Amino acid sequence: MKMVVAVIRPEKLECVKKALEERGFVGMTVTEVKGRGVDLLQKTKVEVVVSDDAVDEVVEAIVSSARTGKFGDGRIFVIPVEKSVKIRTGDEEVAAA
Amino acid sequence: MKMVVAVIRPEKLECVKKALEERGFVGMTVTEVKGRGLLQKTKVEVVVSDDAVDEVVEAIVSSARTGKFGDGRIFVIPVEKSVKIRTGDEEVAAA
Amino acid sequence: MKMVVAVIRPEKLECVKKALEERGFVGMTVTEVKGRGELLQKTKVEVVVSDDAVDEVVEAIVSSARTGKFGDGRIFVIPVEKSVKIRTGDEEVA
């Protein structure tokens, strides 16, 4: 499993949420941040944790929905996640052997 | 080392802090976030040794759970190096 | 690639910002957080760099964020497998 982290223009949040929803990715954590790629501008961090095989689909959904083609569009990082635990059940999601 | 990241109900922060404190885990970073499994949630991050992960995860699950939808999730991410800014001492993951 | 994550005193942000700029590290994400060591207001700074730039980035942050007192914070180095430029769709793979 992987964490897909995108830092986007704040106005793109609804586009990104919709593009992820449409593909079955509803779960997300959103953080208000500041960034730059000269003052720090308001940006929005979107984080989703998905199965390895869903990464490329998630990355492409975010790129398509967050892009303008201008500087300041932001970046997406893919970080490994070793375990994902559902607090309500205690069930842990891992990659088989 | 691992970073244990939990996204919990904001009212559960003190429960989680206490459960971690009781087991010797005092250090933490807390961020105000929004989420859906967008409502206000709290992100708690602790960086621990590999052998402490299961204990930390179970302390958070026990103290943040309600059994209802919206309890949140815990992610375990690898940490390769941890540096103390005050001393410049670096802890490097076993190899 | 790696993500270098530093949790620093809020007053040190400008020092860190400048020390990274001077070395060619302009890209960064900043988050307002609360923290305590092993809750007070702190600042999280995140930079994603090539593997060979990590030690230089860590050095720049340590030098610019330190006071020598307790509460100076910590730096964590986390692996980044893919880095995507949203504007072009170009992906850098580790």
Numbering used by the authors:
A (entry chain B): 1 to 37, 53 to 112
B (entry chain A): 1 to 37, 55 to 112
C (entry chain C): 1 to 38, 55 to 110
Reproduce, without paraphrasing, sentences from the article in which this PDB structure was first reported.
PII proteins are key sensors for the metabolic nitrogen status. Af-GlnK3 shares the canonical fold of PII proteins, consisting of a four-stranded, antiparallel beta sheet and two connecting alpha helices. It forms a tightly packed trimer with approximate dimensions of 30×54 Å. GlnK proteins, when activated, are sequestered to the cytoplasmic membrane where they bind directly to their corresponding Amt proteins, physically blocking ammonium uptake by inserting the T-loops deeply into the transporters' substrate channels.
Af-GlnK3 was isolated without the addition of nucleotides during protein purification, resulting in a structure without any bound ligand and T-loops that were disordered in the crystal packing. Without bound ligands, the T-loops were not found to be fixed in a distinct conformation and were consequently disordered in the crystal structure.
